[PDB]
Ligand binder design. Structure first.
Ligand SMILES: C[S@+](CC[C@H](N)C(=O)[O-])C[C@H]1O[C@@H](n2cnc3c(N)ncnc32)[C@H](O)[C@@H]1O
Ligand SMILES: C[S@@+](CC[C@H](N)C(=O)[O-])C[C@H]1O[C@@H](n2cnc3c(N)ncnc32)[C@H](O)[C@@H]1O
Ligand code: MET
Ligand code: MET
Ligand code: SF4
Ligand code: SF4
Ligand code: SF4
Ligand code: SF4
Ligand code: NA
Lengths: 479, 474, 472, 477
C-alpha cells in the first residue's frame, strides 16, 4: 500500500494517478494556481520518472525533453523541491541505489563540492591495502598471477600504515577501511593495524576472502575483534563453484569452516563485531540465490542465535564478459531477487540485504546495466578528494583497481608515496595544488571500481550542468 | 488514510485502534504468542505515547509507569524495534521536533556518543562570535549595558578566527556558523571571514539583527554574498514594536529597507544566498503572525519573484493558540506559498493541542563537563565558551565557562582536547543556567537521560530511540 | 478493529481505509500503487450497506462514480476483505442482515418469490379469533366488525386441514396470532394440540386478557404450545385503559400471568413466556418499570422465569441511555431474560440516525409474496399481508389470494394465485396492510428484482449466502 | 468474560466460578451462601459439555455427586446464565454444537428419528458415478469393482425422479457425491440442471480428475451447480501417488483446476469452488504449502478466487489414516500458522475444521468418534440421511454405497424403481420398523456424519430412558 506519486518511476506505474496527486499537492499548497496545477504536475512527474531511472542525465537534456524555456525550467526545479513525494519517487525509484547509497550521502558531506572545485582536502575515503599476497586467482580480479610484495617490507609498511591512520580525522568512523588489491589477512600485522585505528577512534571494516581467517589467525591477531565488521567476499556455494571462480580446490570448505568457527567464537566472546558478505552474482549462477540463504542459515546455526548481519548482492563492475551476466539471465533476476527476499524472511529474518546499482533496478522490472566508463569520459585529475588507496610501499593510487603490484600502466596513477618525510595529507595536497593530471590511455578505465565509475559520472554531470549555466541546480538533487 | 498506530501520540487519538494494529503486526510477524498480543500491544503503544510527548523520559521511569519488571521491559524494548509504525508515532508525535531536528541527527552522527564517552573530539558545532559591539539593547538579551570589546582586539581576533576556520575538518559544510553574543555585522572584517570560510569549503549562516545590513556594509564586506544564508532576528513588525523590544528608535524601518534592498541586489546578482527570519510570538499577540506573512510578502515584491526561504517561529489560550497557527499556515499558502516554516520545540507540540511541557535546566541538572564535543563558541579574544549565552563581555560569572583561549600557540583543537582529556569541570552556581540557549538545554537533557539509562543498566537501549552510523559497503 | 467498525456513526474512516489497504496489498489482490483508491471505494460500500441494506447495486455504483466493469471488480474484491463484511453485518443496520435477510436467503425463501414459482409459504399465520374484547387506538380493526359465531366449527376444521398441509423441516412455520384476539376461539387449544401432534411447535400472540384459569381448563391444549407472547399495552390500569379502552384490564392481565406462572411451575411445563412492549416517545424510562413487572412475575413462578421480551418503537440520547439502564437492570433483576429490539431501536442504539421503512403504494409489489408469508382467518380467506386480515377492513378484501375450503387447500390457493400471475394494483391506504416483516420482505424483493434486472443477478442483494459443507 | 471461555484449556476456572456466582446472587436465583457451590456445579457442567457434547445426563449428575432434585434445579439454573451456554457452544467441542447438533434439533430432524416416524430424509445423497480411477488407501471402495455401464440410462432417469421428490425449504438438501467418482457419469450435468430447475443449489464432491474442458463442454449443466468441492489428496505428484496410487495425478488435477479458473472468469460464473483436505499421516507440516496451492489457482483465475477449504481427517480411525499422537500434538501450532498465512495471502478463503481438529486449536486434545457394532442403532437414521446409487439402492450409511463391498448389501432399505419412490422406500422401512443387526465391520460403513448422528441419537434415547426426556441432549433450544 503506497502513494501513487511515490512509485511513479517504476515500470508499469499509473502516471495519470501520479500527475493527479501531484497536481492536488501544488494546488492545495498554493504553489501553482489551480488552473495550471495539471500542466506543471505533468512536467514535475516527467522529471521524477527520468531521474528515478537515469540519475546522471544533464539538466539541459531533461529540459529539451520537456521542450521548455530556461526560466520555466528554473521554476520547475524550484517547484520540484516543494513536492516531497516526487523526491521520494526519485530516491526510491529503479535507480534509487545511486541516490541513497552514494550520490546524496557524498553531496551532503560536501565531498563532491571539494572535488568539483579542485581544492586540496583530505580524502573522504582512504583505502589501506595491507596484503602482500593472495592465494586466490579470481577470473574477475585484475591482480597479476605471481605478483607479490617483498616479505621484508612488512615492518616498514605497517609502520607507514600507522602514521597514515594518525592522519585520519575522527568524526567519521568509516573514513578508513582495510581492503586491498590483494588479500589483507596475509599481512601478519593486520590485527595491530586494526588496534591502532580503534585506539584512534575509528571503526574500520576489513574486506577479505577469509581463507586465512583461521582460529589460529584470530589468536595471533586479536585486534581483529575490535573492528566494526568483517565482510567476506563469497565466490561460491560449494567446492566446485569456488574452484571455477578462484581456481583453487577445496577452497569453499575451508572458508566455510573459518566462518563457522568465527561464528562460534563471536558468540562465546559476545563481540559487537558485525559479519557480512559480498556475493557477486556470476554468469550461470542467478538460480543460486536461494541456496545462498541456506549458506547463511547454516552459518547462523553455528552462531548460537547470533545472526549474520548483512549481505551485499553485487555485480562484476568491470563489464568484461567473464563476469557480465547475459541478458537472458538478466531477465530472470527480477523473479530470482524477489524470491530470494522471500526466503530470507522465512529462514534468515534479521539479515540486511542491499543490491548493486543495476541489480536494484532489476527488481520491479526496470532493465539497467552498470556504468562502463571509457577513457574519453575519465576525468584526468581523478578524484583524490573522494577516495585514494595506499599499499605496502606507501604508494597512493588514484583508483581502487590500480593498486596491484606489477600491473601494467598502474604506476601512472600513483599520486605520490607516503614516506617518513611525506604524509598522505601532503601527497594529496601537492597533487591537487599543482593540478596533477594523468592522460587516459586504453585499458586505464579498468583501474576503476564501481564506486570510482559512479563518482566519475557524477562529477561529469556536475561539470556539464555548471557549464550549462545550471551551477546552483547541478545534479538535479543535492542538498 | 493514515495508520492509527502512527498517530497515537497526539491528543484525542483512538488508542484502541492503535493497539489493534500493533497486535496484528505482532501476530503477523510471529513475535508474540497470540495470548499476549493484547497486553504487549497496550504496553508498546503506551511507550510510543510517552516518548512521543516526553522524549527525555528515563527508561526506568517509563518502566515504572508500565508496571512491568526489568526483564519484561527488556523484551518490550526489543519488540518496539520491530513495530516501525510505533517509531513513527514517536518521531512524528507532539515532541517530534526534538527527535527529528536534534536528537536523532546528532545520535546518528555519533555526537552524543562522543560526549557520553568524554572523548577529546573536535566540536560538532563551532560558533564564531565576531561582533565587538551591538547597537540594540534587547530587554531579553543577557548582554551587559556599557560592555563591548576593545577596538584593539579587531585585528588579532580576525586573524585568530581565520586560524580556527582552517582547523575545521571536511565532511560537514554546516559545522560553523556566524552568530554572537553581540552583533556580528559590527565587525568590518566579517565579510572576509565569510570569504575565508567559503574558500575552506564551508557553507556558513550568519545570525544577525540586520540593522547594519546596509548597502555601505555590503560594499565594505562583499564576502557576505558567499554565505549560505542570512537569518535576521525580527524583533517586531513596526517601529513601536521594535522600540519596545530593542530600545532603538526607527529600527524597523531600517531593517525593512535593508532587507528590501538586499532582496533587490540578490535578484540582480542572482545570488544563491538564502534569507530567513526568526520571529518570537508574544503572549496573546499570536494574531501578529498574519502580519508576519504580510511583511514577507512585501519583501517578496522587492525581489522580483525571488522569495524569502524560511521562518523560525518560537514562543515566549491553548485551543486559541492552536487556532492561530492554523490561520498562520493558511495565509502562508495564500500569500507566501513556498515559505518553509519550522516551529520551536514547545510551539510544535501546541499545534495538535498537546500540553507544552517546559524544559528548565537548573544548576543541579547541569553537567559539570558541559559538552564541548557537541558545541563551543569563540569570541574576538579567542575565548572558547562552553555555552551559547555565556559569550558576552563583562557577563557576570561567565568567564568561569571559558574552556581556554585560542592563541597563535594554542589552537581550538588543543583547547577542547586538553579540557576534555584533563576532565575539566565547572561547578554550577545559581544563575549559570541562563548561559544555556535552547540547544544547550536539549543537549544537556539528552546527556542526562543517556547517563541515567546507562547507570540504570540500560546501556545499549539508552535514550529509548537512537540512530546508528550507516556503514554502506560497496 | 477499525475496518470492522467503519459503518457506525463517527467512525475513523481513514483508519479503515488503511486497514483494508493493507489487506489488498498483502494479498496481491490489487497493485500496491492503487490499493488506497480501491480501499476507499470498498469502505464506502461497507458504510452504505451497513446503514442502508436495500440500496440497489446501480445506486451504489453511481455514487462511487465507476463504470460497470470496475464495479464488478470492486464487488469481487469486497468478498476478499472479511473485516468489511463484518462492518456491514454488525453496522447500525446489522439487525436487518443477521436477523432476517441472511437467514431467509440461506433457506431460499426469497428465491421462490423472485422466480414467481409456486411453493408452500415459509410462514403461515393462522387467525382463529372471531372477536376481540379490546379497541386499541393503534389497531386497524373495525369497530363493530366481527366474525359470524357460526363460522367457528367449520373454520376450526379448515384450520386443522391447513395444519395437515404444513411440510416438515420448520417446526415454527406456523403461528397463532390474528387480526383479532385468538383466545376468543373456544377451540384454539384443540388447534394447538393438533399442531403439536403434527410435529409443530407454534407460538400464540395474544393480549392474554382471556388467559384465565377457566380458559386453561376449557382449552388444555394451550399448554402444549411452544410459547405464549403477551402484547403488553401498559404497566398499570390507567395506561391500559388509555391504550385498549377497557377498564381494569392491567389487573386482569397481570392476574392471569401470575396465575399462569404458578400453574406453569406446578406442571413443570416447558412452555415459554414472552412479552411485546412499545416504548413511547420520551417515556423510555418506563422500560425500568417493565423489569419490575417481569420480576414480580418471576416471584410467582418459583424459579421459573419469563423467557424473552420484544421491545419495539412507535434528540434521542434520552432513549440511548434509557436502553443501557434497561439492559443493566435486566442483569441486576432478571439476568436470564432474552432481549430483542426492532430494526429502528437497534440502530438508535449506537447513535445512528436511521428510521424504519415506509413502503408506499408505488413501491408495493403487485404479486405480493405468498411464497414468504400468508395468513388465514376463520372463513378460510388467505390474506397476502399481515395487517389485512381484519373483517370489514376498508379495501382489505382485494388482498385475498383465495379461500381454503374442503375442496381447495392452502397449497392450491397459493399455487393458483402465483401461476396465473395474480396481482393487486395498490391504492392509497393499502400500505397500512403491511406489518414490519411485510415491509422488509417487500424492500428486499424490490432490491433483488432491481439488481437482477440491472444485470447483477449473482451479486443481487450485495450480501446473500455463505459456504456450508460440514455434512459433506 | 471468564465464564464464556471456561471450557477451553488454560481457563481461569476460579474466575469463571466467581463471575457465575455473582450472576446467581445478583439476580436472586440462589441464596447468597449457596451461590458459590452452585456456581461450581454450573461451571463444571459447561466445561464438561463444552468438551464432551454426548455425555449422558446421568453421567454428569454422578460426576457432580448430587441427586435428581439438585440436578433438576441445576439444569434450570444453567439456562439462566447465558455466558455458560456460550461457553458450551464456543468450547473446544463447539463444532458439534454449532454445525450439526443444534441446527438439526432446530429443524426437528433428530425428533423425527427419535420418534421413529416416516419423514423425508433431511439429507439425500445421490451416488451417480459408475466407476472411479483413484485408489485412495483410506477409501473403502474395492479395487476394480464397477457399475455396469448399461445401468446409466435407467439410473439417470431414476435420479431425476428422486430429485422431483425433494421438498422445498432446504435448497441444499441434495448433493452429488458418491461412493465412486460422480464425474464418470456422462449425464451428471443433466442431473445438475434438473435439480437447478427444481430450485435446488447442489454441490458436486469430486476428485476433479475428469473435470476437463471437454467434460464441461459435454456437460454444460455442471456450470449451474452451487459449488464444486475437489477432494485434495496431495500437493505434488509424489504425494498424490502415495495417497491415490496413480502417477501424474496431481499435475492433471491442478491443470484441470487452473483451466477451470480461466473458464470461470471468462463466463463470470456464479459457481463456487472449494476443497476438502484430509490431514494425512506425515503431512501436518504441509498446511503452509496448501496456501501456496490455493494462491496459484487464484493467479489462474484473474481476480476470481477459491471460495473455501475444509480441513478434515480420516473419520474411520484406521492406522493408515490416523495421525500419530506426536504429529497430532504439532497440529495446534500448525493450524495457527496456517490461518495467519491465509490471512496474509488468500484473505477471502473461508476455512473450517473437522470436529476433532477444531478442538486441537486452543490446545484441547480430541479424537473423532469411533462407533462400534455395540453402539450402532439397528434402525439407523433414514429420517436424517440416505444415499442412492446407480441401481436405485437406498443405502442407510454413506460408506456402504459401494459396489461389491462385502456385507454392504445388508444396509439397503430398498430400491427406487418406476414403481417405488424414495419417499415410499423410507416410509415402508420406517413404518415396518426395519432393523439391521450389526456384525463386525459394519461400523466402517459409517462416515463422520453418520457416527455423530448415531452418538447423538444414542445420547437422546439414553437421556429419555433415564427420565430426562425434556432435558435430553443437555442443549437443544
Ligand atoms: C579484491 S579486494 C578484497 C581483498 C580480498 N582478497 C577479497 O577478495 O575480499 C576488494 C573487493 O572487490 C571485489 N572485486 C574485485 N574485482 C571485482 C570485479 N571485477 N567486480 C566486482 N567486484 C570485484 C572483491 O570481491 C572484494 O570484495
Ligand atoms: C467416497 S468419496 C466419493 C466422491 C469423490 N470420488 C471424491 O473423492 O470426492 C466422498 C468423500 O468422502 C471422502 N472420504 C472417503 N474416505 C474417507 C475417510 N476415510 N476419511 C475422511 N474422508 C473420506 C473423500 O475424500 C470424498 O471427499
Ligand atoms: C544570543 S544574543 C545574539 C543574537 C544575535 N546577535 C541577533 O540579534 O540575531
Ligand atoms: C395484529 S392484531 C393484534 C393481535 C393480538 N390480539 C394482540 O393484541 O397483539
Ligand atoms: S578478488 Fe581478492 S581473493 Fe580474488 S584474486 Fe583478487 S585479491 Fe585474490
Ligand atoms: S539579542 Fe542580539 S541584537 Fe539584541 S541586544 Fe542582544 S546582541 Fe544585540
Ligand atoms: S391490537 Fe389486538 S387486542 Fe388490541 S384491538 Fe387489535 S386485535 Fe384487539
Ligand atoms: S475417495 Fe473418491 S477418489 Fe478416492 S478412491 Fe474413493 S471414490 Fe475414488
Ligand atoms: Na399494585
Amino acid at each position: 500500500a503506497t502513494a501513487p506519486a511515490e512509485r511513479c518511476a517504476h515500470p508499469g506505474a499509473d502516471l495519470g494517478a501520479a500527475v493527479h496527486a501531484v497536481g492536488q499537492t501544488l494546488a492545495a499548497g498554493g504553489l501553482v494556481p489551480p488552473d495550471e496545477a495539471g500542466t506543471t504536475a505533468r512536467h514535475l512527474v516527467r522529471l521524477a520518472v527520468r531521474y528515478g531511472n537515469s540519475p546522471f542525465t544533464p539538466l539541459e537534456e531533461a529540459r529539451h525533453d520537456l521542450g521548455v524555456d530556461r526560466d520555466a525550467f528554473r521554476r520547475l526545479l524550484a517547484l520540484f523541491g516543494q513536492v516531497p513525494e516526487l523526491r521520494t519517487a526519485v530516491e526510491t525509484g529503479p535507480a534509487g541505489a545511486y541516490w541513497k547509497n552514494t550520490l546524496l550521502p557524498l553531496e551532503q558531506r560536501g565531498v563532491f563540492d571539494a572535488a568539483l572545485a579542485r581544492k586540496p582536502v583530505f580524502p573522504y575515503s582512504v583505502g589501506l591495502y595491507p596484503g602482500p599476497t593472495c592465494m586466490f586467482r579470481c577470473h574477475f580480479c585484475v591482480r597479476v598471477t605471481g605478483a607479490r610484495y617483498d616479505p621484508s617490507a612488512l615492518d616498514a609498511g605497517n609502520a607507514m600504515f600507522r602514521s597514515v591512520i594518525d592522519e585520519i580525522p575522527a568524526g567519521n568512523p568509516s573514513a578508513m577501511y582495510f581492503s586491498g588489491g590483494l588479500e589483507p589477512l596475509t599481512n601478519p600485522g593486520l590485527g595491530s593495524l586494526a588496534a591502532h585505528a580503534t585506539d584512534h577512534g575509528l571503526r574500520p571494516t576489513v574486506y577479505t576472502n577469509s581463507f586465512a581467517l583461521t582460529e589460529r589467525t584470530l589468536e595471533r591477531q586479536p585486534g581483529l575483534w575490535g573492528l566494526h565488521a568483517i565482510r567476506t567476499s563469497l565466490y561460491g556455494l560449494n567446492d566446485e563453484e569456488y574452484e571455477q571462480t578462484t581456481g583453487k580446490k577445496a577452497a569453499f570448505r575451508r572458508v566455510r569452516e573459518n566462518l563457522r568457527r568465527f561464528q562460534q567464537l563471536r558468540a562465546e566472546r559476545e563481540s559487537p563485531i558485525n559479519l557480512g558478505f559480498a556475493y557477486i552474482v556470476l554468469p550461470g549462477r542467478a538460480s543460486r540465490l536461494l541456496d545462498l540463504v541456506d549458506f547463511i542459515a547454516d552459518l547462523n546455526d553455528a552462531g548460537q542465535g547470533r545472526t549474520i548481519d548483512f549481505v551485499n548482492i553485487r555485480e562484476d563492475y568491470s563489464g568484461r564478459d567473464d563476469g557480465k551476466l547475459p541478458q537472458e539471465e538478466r531477465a530472470e533476476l527480477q523473479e530470482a531477487l524477489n524470491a530470494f527476499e522471500e526466503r530470507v524472511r522465512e529462514r534468515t529474518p534479521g539479515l540486511h540485504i542491499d543490491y548493486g546499482y543495476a541489480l536494484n533496478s532489476l527488481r520491479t522490472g526496470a532493465d539497467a546495466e552498470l556504468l562502463r566508463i571509457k577513457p574519453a569520459t575519465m576525468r584526468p585529475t581523478a578524484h583524490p578528494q573522494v577516495a585514494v588507496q595506499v599499499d605496502l610501499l606507501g604508494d597512493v593510487y588514484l583508483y581502487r583497481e590500480a593498486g596491484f603490484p606489477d600491473l601494467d600502466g598502474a604506476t601512472r596513477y600513483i599520486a605520490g608515496r607516503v614516506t617518513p618525510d611525506t604524509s598522505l595529507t601532503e601527497v594529496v595536497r601537492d597533487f591537487v595544488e599543482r593540478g596533477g593530471e594523468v592522460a587516459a590511455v586504453d585499458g586505464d578505465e579498468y583501474f576503476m571500481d564501481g564506486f570510482d565509475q559512479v563518482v566519475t559520472a557524477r562529477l561529469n554531470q556536475l561539470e556539464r550542468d555548471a557549464a550549462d549555466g545550471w551551477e546552483e541546480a547541478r545534479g538535479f538533487l543535492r542538498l
